[PDB]
Amino acid sequence: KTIIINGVQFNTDEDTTILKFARDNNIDISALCFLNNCNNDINKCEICTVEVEGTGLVTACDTLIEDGMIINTNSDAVNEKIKSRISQLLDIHEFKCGPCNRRENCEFLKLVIKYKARASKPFLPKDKTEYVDERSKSLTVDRTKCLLCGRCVNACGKNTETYAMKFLNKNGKTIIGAEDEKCFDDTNCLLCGQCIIACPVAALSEKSHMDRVKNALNAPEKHVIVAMAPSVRASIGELFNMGFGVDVTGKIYTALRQLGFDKIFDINFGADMTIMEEATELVQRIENNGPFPMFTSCCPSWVRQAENYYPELLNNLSSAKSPQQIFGTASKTYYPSISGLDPKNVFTVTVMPCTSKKFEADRPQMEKDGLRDIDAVITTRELAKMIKDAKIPFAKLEDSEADPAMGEYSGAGAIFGATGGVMEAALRSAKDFAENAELEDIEYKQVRGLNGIKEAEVEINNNKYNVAVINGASNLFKFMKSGMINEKQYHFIEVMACHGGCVNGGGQPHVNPKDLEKVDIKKVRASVLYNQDEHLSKRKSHENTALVKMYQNYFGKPGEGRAHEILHFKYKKSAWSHP
Ligand code: 402
Ligand code: SF4
Ligand code: SF4
Ligand code: SF4
Ligand code: SF4
Ligand code: FES
Ligand SMILES: [Mg+2]
Ligand SMILES: [Mg+2]
């Protein structure tokens, strides 16, 4: 094919869109509703308008190049059309960036600036409460910001195949929302937040826990523990202009101390606890020749997916609490026992790359003797805002260490945040446990990486077992619906709702679509975690020194007795009932 773009001739056999071809050849075309190789098929945004000679104005993002095409991306007519489209979006947009939570990295603001667009009549809503939905424990909607670009609907479809985010006709006007405009929690929604990650503006956000945290910090009698997820240390630096793939663990510890938290622990300690219990459970299932398979239970969006779509699997879920909840349970029991704190005065905060962790922490039964396992969960983004609001110079902070008693972690815990990390971590301990050995070969590269469904054969005590790693909620559906679960007997299956694992969770820093094409965000964030594992002295969860002391002095033997009494949680399908 011979293509001419802005007077430049190209000769190509590529079969692709104008947008993709132009961008591959360093020709600027704007886009808004195009993302994840999809645009908004109904009511296209047309920000990607170009002019094709003999045809007129076309959308570059969904028009294939054809031989003989003569294209102009920057004519007066093209720019007036794009400016008009942005102007019409401003007409439905509460354009007040000052207090907006996307002020620093908004895609729409960049387009408004680029085209110098202005509303025909400013959109100034008197009563915002009609536009805002904060009922969810995890998600919130601010429709005064919504561009009806469809990126959340497309992302939910692709990431989960639930189509829990939908277009709705609300009193004659188009909105996005959950089925029948219900609270997301009351629908089949997984609360994974991939819709937030896809949103170009501040229309979708996490349910704020910021006030819970500040009120607890300011309460004289509260002793506030903070502990961050594996993924936070591989990601939060993005929001401080430090680039991608930067390990900022020590700076986080320092910032949390400067924020006034009273104890600095780490959820990777809870990850090692989860492995203690789950690898022990796997060995008991092996020794009892069932029940198989056992599924991980640490991703609360996967738990919701099982509850909503596969309730017959709930009995197969590991009973070990997630790293967050298992840490939290220990923070109200073991921690007072080594500190003198009144358990009622301990307030446990986690920092997560995840929105469904808020739903998990707020599950009614996730408590004991009136004490919540976890009192507040803030996302990576929320912690970034806290640090900036306190004027803490994050990129310049010196490194500090965590408090050790619930803060040490092994390399197995460190890799939890990548798809296959829980699998690899659990196998390192289950094989030692079952063979009564301290084995040297601990790297299970077969379960790593971005393939959507991964499987491997492992040898445990001179028998062979089959494991699988499901990498993304849509791939859970593919694995089940395609019958893949029945090609062989699976014994242990890891499921994460977010493709790439928690490093790509719904509470993570937004990345604009341009950077997403230069940077493999899922692999670059996960690289921080595998690097920590490679350089840590202890690379198995049962070699964590602070954890071994806690089990010896307080919990006893994992998987039974006291440990099973309080560190476990079982989900039950609803009993049969009609209708
Ligand atoms: N609880 C828990 Fe996890 C741990 O450890 C996180 O904190 Fe994850 C991350 N990063 C998140 O969110 S949840 C799913 N298992 C893998 S990692
Ligand atoms: S969503 Fe973007 S354009 Fe709209 S108010 Fe917030 S920062 Fe400004
Ligand atoms: S939270 Fe996940 S499942 Fe729910 S609407 Fe958003 S993308 Fe879909
Ligand atoms: S919520 Fe965000 S992604 Fe969804 S349609 Fe509105 S602006 Fe687009
Ligand atoms: S994969 Fe991690 S970040 Fe994503 S929903 Fe599950 S627990 Fe949350
Ligand atoms: S970016 Fe092409 S129609 Fe929206
Ligand atoms: Mg399309
Ligand atoms: Mg305080």
From Swiss-Prot:
SMART domains reported for this sequence: Fe_hyd_SSU
All copies of domain 4Fe-4S ferredoxin-type, residue ranges: 137-166, 180-209
EC code: 1.12.7.2
Binding-site residues for [2Fe-2S] cluster, renumbered to this chain: 33, 45, 48, 61
This protein's record includes keyword ATP-binding: no
CDD domains: fer2
PANTHER family on file: NITRATE, FORMATE, IRON DEHYDROGENASE (PTHR11615)
UniProt subunit comment: Monomer.
Protein name as catalogued: Iron hydrogenase 1
Species this chain originates from: Clostridium pasteurianum
